[PDB]
């Protein structure tokens, strides 16, 4: 379970887009990130890095 607080800035983004990006980071489409493998802790810092 994750709680995220965010300000729009100057270009609005649909929440579902961010949610999809995060949940696919869970499987990790991007290179260099294995994902949530067995025995892998998760931190809000890594989620924020994936978003960034």
């Amino acid at each position: 379970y994750v709680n995220v607080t965010v300000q729009q800035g100057s270009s609005s983004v649909a929440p579902e887009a961010i949610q999809n990006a995060v949940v696919n980071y869970a499987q990790g489409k991007v290179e260099g990130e294995e994902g949530l493998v067995v025995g892998a802790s998760l931190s809000a810092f890594e989620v924020a890095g994936a978003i960034a």
Binding site: Q8, S10, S11, S12, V13, A14
Partner: protein
């Protein structure tokens, strides 16, 4: 003057810098819960007249 593509409209928005998620984009099938029939799982008169 004739742009109908939502992709082109979003590109225009990126050009001008305006935020985009305040606008309805498209009536196409890409919107959630759309289909050619889409008569199932809805109140089709057997449950409620809509």
């Amino acid at each position: 003057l004739k742009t109908a593509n939502p992709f082109g409209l979003m590109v225009w928005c990126i050009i001008l810098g305006t935020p985009s998620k305040g606008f309805g984009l498209y009536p196409k099938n890409s919107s959630w819960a759309f289909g050619r029939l889409r008569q199932n799982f809805i109140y089709s008169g057997t449950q409620v007249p809509p």
